[model samples]
Target chain A: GSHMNSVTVSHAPYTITYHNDWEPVMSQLVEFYNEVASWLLRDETSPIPDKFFIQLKQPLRNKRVCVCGIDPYPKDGTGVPFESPNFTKKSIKEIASSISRLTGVIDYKGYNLNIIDGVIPWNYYLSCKLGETKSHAIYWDKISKLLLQHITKHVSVLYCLGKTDFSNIRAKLESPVTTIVGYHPAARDRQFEKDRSFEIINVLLELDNKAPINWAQGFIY
Target chain B: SGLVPRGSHMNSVTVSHAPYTITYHNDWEPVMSQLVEFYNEVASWLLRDETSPIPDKFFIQLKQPLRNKRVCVCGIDPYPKDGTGVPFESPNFTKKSIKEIASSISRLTGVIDYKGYNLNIIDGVIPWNYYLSCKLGETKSHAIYWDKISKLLLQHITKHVSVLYCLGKTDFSNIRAKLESPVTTIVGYHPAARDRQFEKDRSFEIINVLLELDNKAPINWAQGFIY
Candidate 1:
């Protein structure tokens, strides 16, 4: 009864240890999506099925700072957690632009990163959604919180994108960490010129001297 | 449901018990959240103060999923002799201390099964470590920290359906009321207590009762008396 079946993302840093408990629910999400693939097939598509969507594009082990996105990616291969490079997503451009300004390393083509480490982009909903809710339902709130706890050690600062709330994230933080909330790149008043957002990223890198060598932003060339 | 921020629903925290994740009741969320802070603080304190002992694992029992648990064994601190700077369930665990850990486990399991019979090593029992740091006895200075961990651990155990085996007198009263009435309570003198008289007789009595409470697995007859 103790057997475990895990799926390691090919060419990734870690393997997701899927217990039997997740198999029942996630197995269906994968199966169901296949049957009606066109429903969520476009406009912020999710590469992994529901259960597997619980984690970031980067594994929990590699996270340094968590830059959260409001929803899933719209393109296949691009919708995967945080590694959406080159595709003009406002959040993606803002994230890379914010890092470059913060570190004084201007306009880095996120493609040349040696480490590709740090910076985990996460979403509140593992499944794709459009509108906002005041609070999470019991089901999603539970799964999301659990994932955060496991990755707490690897995270340093949490950058909330758009209107995504940080209240729940704040309550779960175990460290003397920083939370920066700014315009959701998709917003009308959004500005990435320079401000506290860059300061937060700059300060984090200042402390550890973690230059963006490991921090790549683009997809496979 | 008022003007809460749009897409404000994105939030998450790791459910501390891994492999098996149970959403804690909202009532328990505050305490659970505080415990995470406490864990981080204590860990930093150990690292900063060169004098503090580091347990090979931070909160060893938590390493395993709580669902696999059947019995809970509360110990004051990790053994001071080993490096990682602290106690058992480690690579450098001493023969004597290791024996005591097993013996402590045996006493807890024995009383459930036998009236006057012996028992073997009990598997799947979660070790309840009260502190991240090592100390010989409870001191006033450590009260606040210890109390936080004690509450978190007991609160977690109370949610389960296993037996609570309180090893020392200090433990019995503190742990007693928190547990639901249906879960069995097996109390005894602290295994480390100096009273030589309580060792053999008391040990046998406790383990005998444990077997009766949760006899899911068989006790190996070959191992002989636990005390």
Candidate 2:
């Protein structure tokens, strides 16, 4: 079954509006659309390419936290986060279980972390398929700088999922925000990853302890 | 009426950059509220010197709420913090003109200029003056703190929209490509330019920059970037 449809990814609502910085990056996404869609379709069981990042459509006006990822899940798409959707690789199920314990949403069947009220999901690579080169790196650089520019300036806290090298991303930050790294939900080990997941949640919530002013402002506005 | 001070007389003012909830009348309630509290805490440390103009003594008009702003002007910085200082609204900083500028500026929206005061109030056609010198030296380090908040306010609150008018050669040069374009250029000369062509003819140009729905003159361009 071949669905010969071109990818039409829409990141509206929360679409990046800074034109000069994002225009070239967006053009790159458009140029590689067919190729990326083919790769996503190659693995029929993988997440829908266009459906990737559907959760981040919400506007991030007052959001204080962000959960960034390198890319979307290559497989398993039913409108839930690929990290621990109801159907996950047996090895990674423990990581899913950790997110459950952390967020208190036991239903891993279709859990999407972006559903967390103030959390917005973002990726360095807009495509779900695994592919890149030196040129692709340019798109990554632009998008990363644009996102980091806005985030580091505005968001109070940031959480990056998996062990993606964010040294490049962290270097451009101008805001004095906090960044917490956590184990990838797709990790091979279960025990350590689960504990790290717990740690991530604790830090995310611990923000609540010292953020009465932030919390109060959130409530007021 | 309830929001106004008790027995307050008919006042002419335009409020901008307020949290969209303020509906009172006075000359500078919105600007003062946004600025006074924050600067008050740091007054002694950041601005109280032979250099910094005391924000209290002089009326500062830098930014305006997007929905209600008008043509902008530019200025230099504090004359003397504790002494008489100028508002961007007028050229001579005379009491009569200062009073006129305040009453006229209040009927609009606003944001900053430069000592060189850092300004970001162009969107929505909201105008403010740019400052050149504060005591004719580099702006004190403490004043830089305002830039951070100014950026934050611009990024979060300001929607890029306006008919930007450049008042003079320096102001025009400073803003050549600073904002995203489709920016309509309205023809007007500098209010405080060294060249006095308008003064020679008494035909200085002015703009009907979109101000809040009122009879208040178009702008009271902010002295600070806050309210």
Candidate 3:
């Protein structure tokens, strides 16, 4: 799609924010778009490419708010992480499923997990750990800046969990004027074992009740 | 008001890693929960450490140099049996969830950071600092982190950032103490948290922040990498 149509492909890395690795997903996306385009189009001579761009508009219509969460592991002296972590397939599926699970509604292509490597190598994390608590403070502030730059947008509200995401994101969320609600994911998960954690969901849905029904929205503003 | 502890008047702090450390872990430990718990262990020590004051040089000496040649992967690890799970808001420490947590953080997010030095999973200083490190009587944690993270955060306008995408209010105030430049940022719960129950995870704003609804976009000068 030449930037006109809108399409979403699952089986993608959840933590990924940008399409650095657009393989497999891209082709499949195009295939789906082509079929959809063919059905939507009335003209027989028109190429799917035309409809591709036409149907593939922006990501979504409503404004988006990225919940910048954290999962910091350890880093080695090499300044590289031993492994990468993301929203995980389970997290993604769970997120998508929540909409139906909570609202008792279906057809939720709600949100996608652009999984990115949120972990820092042990050494890198250690470097700051060894320093004064200030070391760690500065480390997060620095990391926060990077996140703000890439994910920065005015379309949605920011939700911070863990510690790293909060430290980095605090600057943008000025509070009072802005409505940012925070909590420990573990707390809700452990405290409310069942009921789909609707308390959290209700807090999130405190704002919107849109299509596909974003269960995650249950946790929004 | 209800969340603030009323008369309790609780407080806290934050940190960063501008320069990379030589002793940091660069590989997955597999034991993600225990590995992350070590931080709380250290945090406990500071909370109890009569000598370790907020922004103390001793604490600084203990920190490793944060490097810029890195991105950040952020996730949550549950506390071990030895630590305080209540109020702290840590999730269960099970192998399956650990696997899930590990699997989720391996992409885009940098997932290493616990190699050597064997930080105790149930340490007191880290946790105490996390929940209580505020600027009022803050000593061991009186540093800044909003615009920058540690050294890099203080570097005026540098590319080296101390990524903290998931940290919540505890760490958020800590960052307010520091940071010079105006950068794009958001803090709260992740969007997926709606369905999954986790305390303190307000996420619609998360989408708004990421999608740029709050207009929290990066400064024009913040453009980096292959343009």
Candidate 4:
């Protein structure tokens, strides 16, 4: 018989399970989610799943880059950061093109950059209401800081997307994990291309003796 | 007087006094409205008479609207002597003070002309000179009286401003905590301080890095001001 340890938390019809290896870090997350569930029970909005909306394809120890967004898409999201049904082909292409311009890596094929190995996609706010972004970020500020402080232990780089101010969280981040901030893919006036994100990312990865992300091959439908 | 056709742009509003005729761009309407309301509602007591005019000191000399404003340079209060009702533009300012301030700004923005930069200059307490006759302790009392209005204005103006440059003992902690968006706040010495401390302050370099991180172009500080 095969056995694997996991951490599971549920809130009426929604159950989230993660490998026990993410404990201590995820244990705090599980506790935070319980608080969220208690708060949501009194909230006026419809019931939201008590999931963090964070995806770790491989174990946290194996991931090299952590891509973080401000929040999950308000609605029509697949419980994954940035994986929204609202994104059309054109919008996806535009986002990919912006990433290509910033990273200097061509040939991104889709919106899901996490398809590449060693990359995990996450969000600063684990939950959000429809059409609202900033409020959720503010509410989850403390928990998000704890999450970032813990996750930075494993990743070589924490790439923050968008203009969400990370001033508060920047100081608490673990040392040795380089942070590259870039404009949101939806930013106007080609602002997304202004930051030297991937250049720095590749350099930091090289110093750590890790392979640079093949941004060209990471896209998935 | 006979009706005569005088040439003037309809899109701009001109505020005329004996020595100054300032024409503002049309986009300043909403910002000006709020400022005017604040002045009329709260600080109207400063308007002692026609001679001692307590004019609006908050100048929106930027090329864009409030939402597009990227920087805000804050001072404690307007200079009491020969005040021009504009932040940092007091006639009493010495050549050395002007050069020092202009140089600091120029060094960070790469823009020599102070007016050319996308900046909004404001004072912690508005209409400070008009309060000169009172027993108020200069900036503190007026700052406290105007605290609520000041908070509203700061919240409105900082909606898109990337940095809030607080100068010389002007504490923004009370207001900074209330802002919804994250604004990078930098504190430095007042330009006209006796020691000329602003010249030595590293706020310029810090602001420069912040602007870059936000994908903003540095102000071209080399063009206009004589350093």
Taking the candidates one at a time, how many backbone clashes does each contain? Answer: 30, 37, 213, 7
Specify the highest-lDDT model's number: 4
In order, what lDDT does every prediction score?
0.45, 0.38, 0.28, 0.51
TM-score of each: 0.38, 0.34, 0.23, 0.42
Measured against the true chain A, the candidates' chain A TM-scores are: 0.56, 0.56, 0.34, 0.77
Candidate 2: CAPRI quality band: incorrect
CA RMSD (A), model 2: 18.8
TM-score of 3: 0.23
Residue B123 lDDT (model 4): 17
Question: Residue B99: error of model 3 in Å?
Answer: 60
In terms of docking quality, model 1 is: incorrect
Per-residue lDDT of candidate 1, residues B1-227 (tens digit): 33212111111233222212222222344455666665555544343322223322344334344565566655555455342322234443343434454454455555333212111133545555555454433322243445666666676765663566565667455433354345666665665566553463455356446656566443333243332
Error of 2 at A131 (Å): 8.4
Supply candidate 1's per-residue lDDT for A180: 67
lDDT of 3 by residue, A125-202 (tens): 112332122234333344334333333333233444334334534454322322344443343453333334423432
Ranking by TM-score: 4, 1, 2, 3
lDDT of 2 by residue, A20-125 (tens): 2123245555444433444344433324444443433333443456666665454454323434444445423554456545434443354344433334456555
Question: How close is chain B to the truth by TM-score, in each candidate?
Answer: 0.56, 0.38, 0.28, 0.59
Candidate 2 wrong stretches, greater than 4 Å: A1-49, A52-56, A76-86, A89-95, A102-108, A128-138, A164-171, A190-221, B1-227
Q: Residues A1-221, candidate 4, lDDT per residue (tens digit)?
A: 01123556655324555433355666676677666665543442211564453352234654678888776665554556666444463334555665566545554336565444456677776666655655465456667877777778888888887765454554376565678877775667754363355446656776777646545434443
What's candidate 1's i-RMS value?
Answer: 13.3
lDDT of 1: 0.45
